[PDB]
């Protein structure tokens, strides 16, 4: 709205941080509004880490809006990316686990639960005693 | 080399198609060689539907007097036996299947049509004869196959038949024994009329080298399924039904002795054995198992 014009890496970073903050105070009514305006400028970016921090923050907008099954698809995706540092792929995979478990009993969820026992990386997670016992009924 | 038959000579087919030894002699084709895959899928198609008759299409070739069947598949049609030529519903899935199948390997042409007959032998009904006559009329080299899945089980061996119909005008020669199978009276009439209008084909079963070698390697772990077979609750609703058939056949011959088709106790006696012979054979494999697995002590 301002007179001046700004770049992609500033606007996509600003709406990233705005949406991330309204969630931290528990208010997804506000956080959903600015991440929607962030999606306009994420296709336009050539930044290989800023698009990654959008999908980490878009997975959380579906998490705090209780779309747990679709949130698991975002989180699971990010743990498989090598560009993301190894200690940050552990959190990426574990947030998928929580949102795979707490979702409603979908058939899509049964295939996620299968991917979660198939992946040895999940064995390291603390809710494996739940998952092991969940997937195998 | 056993794989003499899994070969497919296409130019030889179209020379025979033009030559035609079937328009010269009415009963030319007498034998029928059924492949390894063809047998399994046809048996599987019949039982899969089960109680209901469902027909598919067969693919194959000709050789001498033998009408060889190579590969088979299903036709998603309904009203088999109740409609004359029930394959008309899915004229799409005949040519469309062979057009897809020829891209992947199945070069074989239309050789016939097969249907299931659950719990009442292998034969052509009055509805089946009208289908096959007109099949032979236009779409030549076409053979009508039949399988009885429910009895294949209880009898304990492949219950199957392959037939061809005669012309409406010329009538068959004499040489014909034709073996007896229990025909339920509800159907005996329909069979009885149109039964002499056709002739069967001498069935034979073959296999490839790989098929033969695979089945031998397969048998290492398939003996387990033989001794946990139990043909009792599997086909429970054939044997329990055959009783209902048997009861009627006696009911007739009882009154036949009285006041009032020639001695229908001789049939019923053979049916009472037929059906019970199975029931006993069942309890052979059961006691065989009780002997084996239960009686070891700790």
């Amino acid at each position: 709205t301002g007179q001046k014009q700004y770049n992609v890496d500033y606007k996509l970073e600003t709406y990233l941080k705005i949406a991330r903050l309204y969630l931290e105070d528990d208010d997804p009514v506000q956080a959903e509004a600015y991440i929607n305006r962030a999606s306009l400028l994420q296709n336009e970016s050539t930044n290989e880490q800023l698009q990654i921090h959008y999908k980490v923050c878009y997975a959380r907008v579906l998490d705090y809006r209780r779309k747990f099954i679709e949130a698991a698809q975002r989180y699971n995706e990010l743990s498989y990316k090598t560009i993301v540092h190894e200690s940050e792929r552990l959190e990426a995979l574990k947030h998928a686990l929580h949102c795979t478990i707490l979702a409603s009993a979908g058939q899509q969820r049964s295939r996620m639960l299968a991917t979660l026992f198939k992946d040895e990386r999940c064995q390291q997670l603390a809710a494996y005693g739940i998952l092991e016992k969940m997937y195998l009924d | 080399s056993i794989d003499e038959i899994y070969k497919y000579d296409k130019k030889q087919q179209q020379e025979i198609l033009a030559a035609k030894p079937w328009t010269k002699d009415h009963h030319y084709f007498k034998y029928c060689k059924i492949s390894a895959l063809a047998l399994l899928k046809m048996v599987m198609h019949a039982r899969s539907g089960g109680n209901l008759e469902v027909m598919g299409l067969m693919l194959g070739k000709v050789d001498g007097e033998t009408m060889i069947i190579m590969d088979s598949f299903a036709l998603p049609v309904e009203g088999t036996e109740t409609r004359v030529n029930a394959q008309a519903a899915a004229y799409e899935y005949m040519a469309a299947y062979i057009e897809n199948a020829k891209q992947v390997g199945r070069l074989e042409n239309a050789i016939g049509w097969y249907h299931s007959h659950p719990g009442y032998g292998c034969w052509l009904s009055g509805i089946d004869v009208s289908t096959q006559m007109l099949n032979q009329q236009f779409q030549e080299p076409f053979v009508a196959v039949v399988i009885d899945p429910t009895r294949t089980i209880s009898a304990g061996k492949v219950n199957l038949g392959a037939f061809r119909t005669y012309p409406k005008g010329y009538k068959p020669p004499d040489e014909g024994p034709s073996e007896y199978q229990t025909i339920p009276l509800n159907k005996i009439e329909d069979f009885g009329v149109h039964c002499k209008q056709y002739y069967a084909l001498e069935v034979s079963y073959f296999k490839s080298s790989l098929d033969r070698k695979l089945l031998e390697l397969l048998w290492n772990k398939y003996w387990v399924n033989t001794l946990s077979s139990s043909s009792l609750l599997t086909n429970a609703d054939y044997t329990t039904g055959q009783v209902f058939d048997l009861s009627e056949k006696l009911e007739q011959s009882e009154a036949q002795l009285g006041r009032g088709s020639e001695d229908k106790l001789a049939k019923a006696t053979r049916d009472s054995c037929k059906t019970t012979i199975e029931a006993i054979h069942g309890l052979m494999s059961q006691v065989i198992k009780d002997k084996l697995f239960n009686q070891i002590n700790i």
Partner: protein, 189 residues
């Protein structure tokens, strides 16, 4: 090496012998067509309930070759997906098959193309001219781990119990054990 080797589990698999024979017919026929051994490829179908998986029937798929990479022509799969949903309306898409050695890179590239279609694609591989005195048919699945800072696909091998259907069992007992003039006096027993 490009297979898994780890503490597996996951699903439990069954296997109908009709599937083995439909591949066997498909190998011998395509082998015969070209006068050489052929790596034939096709699709798997059957019942899927909960974890457990049964493979009932199987058919063929169209394939091409971009450079050295085996391209499953998907436009053919979707066409046959029509026709197999017609006849066996109950059945589901499960996986795919091929012939040759054990699992290798050329099938991992194909496994990616089946992974676009479904989220849990099984994989059978058969050795036609096998040296094994045992059966050369082993079942596998897609598993992915960290290969030294690299998330990448692997094959976790699984076992297979054989199918039981009484009507089918006779089909096996007939061709694997043929009455080629071996019963004169009925006997029955």
């Amino acid at each position: 090496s490009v297979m898994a080797c780890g503490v597996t589990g996951s699903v439990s698999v069954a296997l109908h012998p009709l599937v083995i024979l439909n591949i066997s017919d498909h190998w011998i026929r395509m082998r015969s067509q070209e006068g050489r051994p052929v790596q034939v490829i096709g699709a798997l179908i059957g019942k899927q309930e909960g974890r457990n998986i049964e493979v009932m029937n199987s058919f063929e798929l169209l394939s091409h070759t971009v450079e050295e990479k085996i391209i499953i022509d998907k436009e053919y799969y979707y066409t046959k997906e029509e026709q197999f949903k017609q006849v066996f309306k109950e059945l589901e898409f499960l996986g795919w098959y091929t012939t040759g050695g054990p699992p290798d890179p050329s099938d991992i590239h194909v496994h990616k193309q089946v992974c676009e279609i479904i989220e849990s694609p099984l994989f059978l591989k058969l050795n036609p001219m096998t040296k094994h005195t045992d059966l050369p048919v082993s079942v596998f699945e897609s598993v992915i781990d960290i290969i030294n800072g690299e998330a990448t696909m692997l094959f976790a091998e699984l076992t297979y119990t054989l199918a039981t259907e009484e009507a089918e069992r006779i089909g096996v007992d007939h061709v694997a054990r043929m009455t080629a003039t071996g019963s004169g006096e009925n006997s029955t027993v």
